Each structure stands twice: as C-alpha cells, then as structure tokens.
C-alpha cells in the first residue's frame, strides 16, 4: 500500500503547479494508472 501512496502524494504535489498540460504530471498520472491496474490484478 505504501508503494501506491508514494505515487499518489507525488501526483498531488505535481497538481499544485497550476499547469494541467505539464508533461511531468501527465507522466505521473500514466504511472498511477499502471500501478492501480497492477494492484487490481493481484486482488
């Protein structure tokens, strides 16, 4: 669960730049999608 909470907090801090087209936030969201799908495949 800590491996997911780290990426969730990182994306939450990347939101605060107030730039939705920032490529780093796009890459963080694409990383969270893969992490959540790999968590759901296990349960």
């Amino acid at each position: 669960i800590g491996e997911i909470k780290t990426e969730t907090e990182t994306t939450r801090f990347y939101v605060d730049y107030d730039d939705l087209m920032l490529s780093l936030l796009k890459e963080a969201a694409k990383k969270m999608i893969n992490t959540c799908n790999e968590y759901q495949k296990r349960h």
């Binding site: 780290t6 907090e9 990182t10 801090f13 990347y14 605060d16 730049y17 107030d18 730039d19 780093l24």
Partner: protein
C-alpha cells in the same frame, strides 16, 4: 519516495528562471519540507520510546 522526485523536478524545471511557476514551486518546497521534518521527528520519538521500554 516523494521528496527525491519533487527535488528532481525542482532541478529539472529551473535550469533557467521560469517566472510563471516561481510562485508555486516555493509553496511546494515549503509544504514537502514541513511534512518531512514532522514525520522524521515523530519517527525518532517513537524509536526512542521503543528503546526505553526494555
């Protein structure tokens, strides 16, 4: 895990002075470091009480 990526984002974004993101980068830095000092202090106090229990 959060700090070592936010600081790398700080080094990556501000090789030159980007004045648009300058007012928010300071708030991000202050928020993550004030979170970190509190977490590290609470971890040290917990380990100290666990050492004193014996």
């Amino acid at each position: 895990g959060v700090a070592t990526q936010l600081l790398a984002a700080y080094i990556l974004l501000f090789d030159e002075y980007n004045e648009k993101k300058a007012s928010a980068q300071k708030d991000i830095l202050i928020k993550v470091l004030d979170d970190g000092i509190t977490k590290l202090n609470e971890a040290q106090k917990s380990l100290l009480v666990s050492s004193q229990s014996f």
